[PDB]
């Protein structure tokens, strides 16, 4: 009867249980849950019930992971597993693991394996891998959301107790929405990209599916350090909030778009009409100067950096693409440099439009998604479809700015919303407790059943 | 029997003395001087004269620069004056002063008017551009020096008391090396490129020539500040350093290059030798990532910025450049925004490396440049031998560096040597210290005749 949360695997050794057990119950879980689409690659059961087997016997001392199952989504370099970012003829066999799964790994963490994702990362629907769209845990017609689909999904079907994400559109934010989980994505250079393939190499972040905001918060921290092989990598400033007098941006109502989402534009509301009983403080700001840069991020230059990335393969092997991710990268072929940076004089004049609205307001919440599509819908409107879903994602790190995203609750069709809070570079251990008292005000449970959620809560200091 | 400085300008007023009169005597020396290469454009005499007599009649409070001549850089915009960057077709005149124009015109200041440059701010020879080659002080075969050409020469030959450059490559310290000058470059954002032609513009920084380094420091402190339409404007920090245990790198010998300047060499090795008598501890320190990134601004994808600014004239009328620049500008529009992107990839690789040598040095000490060129050697080298030129000086804007170049000495020839101090950003207030006590420690003259030096001397705080 096991809770797979790192708290309900604390309490599950606690009482006589084992590692062992757990895997065994965690490869139960999976061999029965029949999404099709969550894997590219699991481990041999008995390959990771021997390496159970060898931590039963360690001491947990200095292992804040002691026997913990975690997924990693095939993009981040996984050792004993081969990686293909969804991409077959991509595949390859890492010789070592990513810094961040080093580092996890060696706090006790176990992996069963690579969840699929949108390929090459370049996706916010969970829909563009040859391995198949997973599905929302709440509705299988309805969209995981991306681009780190399985790996939202395995979170909340409770095949494992975190995940690992990667963020540059909104990939660790937007499936922890579809999925009623907590998504943290990271300052950028807080975790090393050592060991992951690039996107957009100067944006992503490699973010954690979590039960509780404790306990992505911790799994971070454990993750969380300078990596000198990582050119973008960032050693830890640790800047702060206020919790009394907080104040909280939220769009203008003209600039509050759903695309037809009477529901989660109800939901939204209800965010706000729960957040009166909160020490929170409401502000309302100039949402342009955001919606209009993380419009650069694909109506803009930066799409190259995905070219730089897979562009040998694209002429080693062009069919063996996403037909859609595909006539996303092949479009970028037409970007000079001028064009690049161009692109950066708009982001650094947003910016200082944006520095404006920072004045105005100290943390900044928002619907992750407008809405949520049909699979089939998005099979047929594959772009305009996926594009609706980053209207208020794709800022985030071309700003320098961190989030967090946050169940925030459910629509009669019985599928969930969830908001982000998006806030200031390294504001991200005191805007992590924020995001906690929200999301247990607003929807107190995580995942497939909304199950209770996994103590400790967090408290200031 | 003027001295053109500000301190020389006080006293002069001081003792009964007129602005009117300054301003004739300023005249006086600029109709006399014979270079005819350090002008584009001269305001009419009776319009500096009465505006002069204006400035009599006003009172002197709050005006730091009172009655002061400068000259200024034809990129920066001055209002009453055309624009032209050396290229006639693209001349505009300006209806408003750039803010540091205003900045400094309303501290007190006058504008005889617009000096040479380098074609749109593209070299550091003086040479490209169609109004001809400025010459150094100290030899009519011998370059000014670039971009920022006829603003130094402006200043050394004593025809103003101080000039405004522009700086990307070297171009405001290049200059000031070569007619014997304080050459200020300000951290980037510092000063507002609110009316500045466009060369690199993410990396543009507005810079001070001056007699020493308190007065090219008052200045700065005058025209810094933050420009909301200026995208790339930053409010002032202020970081600092130690006076008491400083540490100063100097490049390996091995990384010690002066280009067959044996002269040059000897006399960089003189600034060492006459720096034990001071509170300066050296270090020896890696300058390669320095070297290699200082090279990816023309030999990398920045180049391109120039294509943004210009661009549209090299469409419309491609003759009206000069052949050199033109052959510059005309290969970035092979750059794609891949290879746009990787060139950060690299910057940001090199920038690690750079801030492990910033760990073992609290400032930079280099040769302004590691020689210095007949003007008819680059009438047909002028490429090769003009990039020879910055070799110490590229890297800085690009790794968001602050440097200030002092008079260092002078060779058998009688040319003079110029060294740089290179810091991190925002170390300008007390950066700007250590490079008087060096700049008093070498050559304690400044200009065409050494002249003595204008007091204040800088003391700590």
Same mark, same amino acid.
């Given at each position: ?22 895997? +065994? ?60 970012? /969804? ?25 069963? @394996? ?7 990362? +370049? ?11 997973? $599905? ?9 959301? @991306? ?91 640790? $800047? ?22 009477? /529901? #989660? ?8 009409? *729960? ?22 991020? #694909? @109506? ?91 209207? #208020? ?18 629509? *009669? ?6 908001? +982000? ?24 449970? #995580? ?11 967090? *408290? *200031?200091?």
């Amino acid at each position: 009867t096991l809770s797979m949360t790192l708290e309900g695997i604390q309490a599950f050794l606690a009482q006589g249980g084992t590692i062992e057990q757990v895997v +065994t119950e965690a490869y139960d879980r999976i061999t029965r849950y029949g999404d099709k689409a969550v894997w590219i690659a699991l481990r041999p059961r008995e390959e990771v019930l021997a390496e159970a087997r060898a931590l039963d016997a360690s001491p947990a001392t200095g292992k804040p992971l002691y026997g913990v199952p975690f997924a990693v989504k095939d993009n981040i370099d996984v050792a004993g597993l081969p990686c293909s970012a /969804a991409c077959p003829a991509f595949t390859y066999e890492p010789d070592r693991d990513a810094t961040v799964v080093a580092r996890l790994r060696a706090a006790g963490a176990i992996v069963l @394996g690579k969840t699929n994702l949108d390929q090459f990362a +370049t996706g916010l629907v969970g829909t563009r891998s040859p391995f198949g769209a997973p $599905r929302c845990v709440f509705d299988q017609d309805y969209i995981s959301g @991306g681009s780190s689909s399985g790996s939202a999904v395995a979170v909340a079907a409770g095949l494992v107790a975190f995940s690992l994400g990667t963020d540059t559109a909104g990939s660790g934010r937007v499936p922890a929405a579809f999925n009623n989980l907590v998504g943290v994505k990271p300052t950028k250079g807080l975790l090393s990209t050592s060991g992951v393939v690039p996107a957009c190499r100067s944006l992503d972040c490699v973010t954690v599916f979590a039960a509780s905001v404790a306990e992505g918060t911790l799994i971070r921290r454990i993750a969380e350090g300078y990596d000198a092989a990582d050119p973008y990598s960032r050693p830890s400033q640790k $800047r702060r909030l206020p919790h009394v007098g907080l104040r909280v941006g939220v769009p203008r109502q003209d600039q509050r778009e759903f695309y037809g989402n009477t /529901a #989660y534009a109800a939901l939204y509301q209800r965010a706000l009409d *729960e957040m009166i009983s909160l020490d929170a403080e409401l502000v309302e700001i100039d949402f342009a100067p955001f919606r209009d840069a993380a419009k650069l991020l #694909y @109506g803009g230059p930066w799409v190259a950096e995905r070219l730089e990335a897979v562009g040998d393969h694209l002429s080693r092997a062009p069919d063996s693409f996403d037909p859609v991710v595909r006539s996303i990268v092949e479009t970028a072929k037409t970007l000079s440099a001028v064009d690049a940076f161009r692109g950066q004089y708009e982001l650094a004049a947003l910016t200082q439009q944006a520095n404006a609205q920072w004045a105005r307001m100290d943390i900044l919440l928002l619907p992750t998604a407008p809405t949520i599509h049909k699979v089939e819908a998005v099979m047929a409107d594959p772009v305009r479809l996926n594009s609706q879903l980053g209207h #208020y994602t794709n800022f985030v790190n071309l700003l320098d700015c961190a989030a967090i995203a946050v169940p925030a609750g459910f629509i *009669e069709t019985g599928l969930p919303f969830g908001v +982000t809070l998006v806030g200031p570079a390294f504001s991200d251990d005191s805007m992590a407790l924020i995001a906690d008292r929200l999301h247990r005000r607003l929807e107190p449970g #995580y995942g497939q059943d909304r199950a209770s959620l996994p103590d400790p809560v967090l *408290e *200031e200091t």
